[PDB]
């Protein structure tokens, strides 16, 4: 197999990154170091038109947690966007 | 899976007087 996600991230231009850096900021609005833990992520859901619980929110973080830390960062967060690039399944 | 359309429409840009 290969890395269709880790490859796209590195192949991102300032046009895309400039967009991800936006949510990454509102995603950690109140964090201590600069990561996510649902407490900050869910805060956006209410505005996104939804509101997941703290027990399920972990799914949004465990979907890209390759470090076993629990919180997401510019590394795991970015991939979370490539996996949902466009819907065509 | 993060509502790409409802993502910017809700936050990251919502100034409307
Ligand atoms: Ca992590």
**Domain ranges across chain A:** 1-89
Cα distance between residue A86 and residue A84, in whole Å: 6
Cβ contact (<8 Å) for A81 and B2? Answer: yes
Cβ contact (<8 Å) for A49 and B6? Answer: yes
Q: How far is residue A56 CA from its own chain's centroid?
A: 15
Specify whether domain A1-89 bears CATH 1.10.238.10: yes
For residue B16, list chain A residues with Cβ-Cβ distance below 8 A.
Answer: none
Q: What share of chain B is helix, strand, coil (3-state, %, to 5)?
A: 40, 0, 60
Q: Who contacts A22 (Cβ-Cβ below 8 Å, separation ≥6)?
A: B8, B12
Is the distance from CB of B5 to CB of A84 less than 8 angstroms? no
Experimental method: NMR
Q: Who contacts A36 (Cβ-Cβ below 8 Å, separation ≥6)?
A: A27, A28, A60, A61, A71, A72, A73, A77
Identify the DSSP state of B15.
-
């Amino acid at each position: 197999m290969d890395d269709i996600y880790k490859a796209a991230v590195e192949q991102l231009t300032e046009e895309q990154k400039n967009e991800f850096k936006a949510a990454f900021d509102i995603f950690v609005l109140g964090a201590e170091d600069g990561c996510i833990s649902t407490k900050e992520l869910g805060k956006v859901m209410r505005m996104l038109g939804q509101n997941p619980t703290p027990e399920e929110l972990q799914e949004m973080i465990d979907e890209v947690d390759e470090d076993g830390s629990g919180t997401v960062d510019f590394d795991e967060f970015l991939v979370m966007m490539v996996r949902c690039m466009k819907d065509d399944s | 899976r993060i509502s790409a359309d409802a993502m910017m429409q809700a936050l990251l840009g919502a100034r409307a007087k």
